[PDB]
């Protein structure tokens, strides 16, 4: 992403929506739900807060943080070796290898009995109130505005309180701004293209940056001169 | 002269994936998972935007500099041959 | 005689990117990230402008000067051969 994620409070979107006379029954309560829906539907990883938090494994099981949404990595605390996805169907079940993990709810199922594991996860940036905090990018703001307007107009169209042409226009505009917002947050910046370039050109390919925390992924590959 | 350049659009890289790690696994496996049902493709899928956005392939900044280079090399061969002939010193007569 | 010339339109260089650094990384990686959902493409995507603006490839100022050069070289070979014959001095008889 080229631009920086400067955070602003949620009613910034209600400042802009309520300019429309047909959206004056919208509320913070509705904006919260539709904002969370938009955040998930776009799935942008720059909108989440990166956190690292250690936990203990009692026996092939560990308690997971409260605010976790998605895991970047899990690794062993003492070695630093990363874990992979668990493909085993009988992990801690005995009868009569490398470490891996599997997470469903508040519980992470590892293949290790008693160790500390480090989890690098993504959460939502919250407010002084326990509420979501949105980027102030006017592209993001316009796209979220258009998302909420599209949902409200879809309800009102299901009633027959909006013309089909009005909803068709709203859907067209939301679709274009959704694509544009997707490209805004995903296209790398200059530093991210230097990292991608140093990942791309290897005379000797590097294929083991998962073992580390992808630390050396964008490190330049130097060849000595002979 | 640089190689061909591909114009790559990242509108289908799956959600929650960095471009760097996506491309890294594409290198390793030669297979890149994409997401045709991203929110950014909603207009094209639902018919609100031009369908060329989910199609049309990837563009190329190709310049035909190889043909120019071949032409110059052939001209060099011709001129060296003609100098050899006018000097009265053939290629077979140098070696 | 100069090489082929490509007509490059920069309407899809991503936002906040200079043309120089964009082209520099395109050189290095042979891959140029573009942005199909730029504000300048809104008309073509939404159907308000001709769809050729998001399509049609890149044009070429190509001149067929190589064929002319080959014709002149062949004529030179023919004339030198004919002078050799009329003089009674064949190529095999010079070497």
């Amino acid at each position: 992403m080229v631009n920086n994620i400067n955070w602003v409070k949620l009613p910034v979107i209600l400042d802009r929506l309520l300019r429309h006379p047909l959206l004056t029954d919208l509320n913070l309560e509705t904006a919260i739900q539709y904002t969370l829906d938009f955040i998930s539907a776009m799935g942008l990883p720059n909108v989440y807060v990166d956190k690292i938090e250690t936990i203990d494994i009692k026996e092939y099981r560990g308690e997971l943080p409260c605010d976790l949404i998605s895991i970047n990595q899990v690794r062993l605390h003492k070695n630093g070796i990363a874990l992979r996805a668990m493909t085993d169907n009988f992990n801690a079940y005995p009868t009569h290898g490398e470490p891996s993990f599997k997470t469903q709810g508040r519980v992470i199922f590892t293949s290790i009995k008693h160790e500390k594991v480090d989890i690098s996860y993504k959460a939502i940036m919250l407010d002084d109130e326990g509420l979501p905090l949105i980027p102030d990018n006017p592209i993001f703001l316009k796209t979220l505005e258009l998302y909420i307007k599209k949902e409200w107009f879809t309800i009102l169209f299901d009633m027959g309180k909006i013309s089909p042409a009005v909803l068709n226009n709203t859907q067209q505009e939301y679709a274009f701004k959704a694509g544009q917002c997707n490209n805004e947050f995903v296209i790398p910046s200059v530093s991210e293209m230097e990292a991608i370039t140093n990942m791309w050109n290897q005379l000797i390919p590097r294929v083991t940056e998962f073992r580390r925390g992808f630390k050396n992924l964008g490190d330049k590959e130097y060849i000595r001169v002979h | 002269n640089w190689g061909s350049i591909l114009e790559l659009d990242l509108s289908k890289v799956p959600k929650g994936w960095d471009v760097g790690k996506w491309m890294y696994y594409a290198r390793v496996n030669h297979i890149a998972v994409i997401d045709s049902f991203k929110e950014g493709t909603i207009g094209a899928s639902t018919g609100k935007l031009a369908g060329a956005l989910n199609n049309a392939g990837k563009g190329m900044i190709e310049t035909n500099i190889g043909n120019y280079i071949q032409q110059q090399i052939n001209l060099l061969e011709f001129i060296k041959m003609e100098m050899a002939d006018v000097a009265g010193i053939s290629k077979q007569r140098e070696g | 005689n100069w090489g082929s010339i490509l007509e490059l339109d920069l309407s899809k260089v991503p936002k906040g990117w200079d043309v120089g650094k964009w082209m520099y990384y395109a050189r290095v990686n042979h891959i140029a990230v573009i942005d199909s959902f730029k504000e300048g493409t809104i008309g073509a995507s939404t159907g308000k402008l001709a769809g050729a603006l998001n399509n049609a490839g890149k044009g070429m100022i190509e001149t067929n000067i190589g064929n002319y050069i080959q014709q002149q070289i062949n004529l030179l070979e023919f004339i030198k051969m004919e002078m050799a014959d009329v003089a009674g001095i064949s190529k095999q008889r010079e070497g």
Binding site: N168, Q172 | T46, G47, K48, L49, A50 | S45, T46, G47
Partner: peptide, 4 residues
Amino acid sequence: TSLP
């Protein structure tokens, strides 16, 4: 309608 949808033809853009």
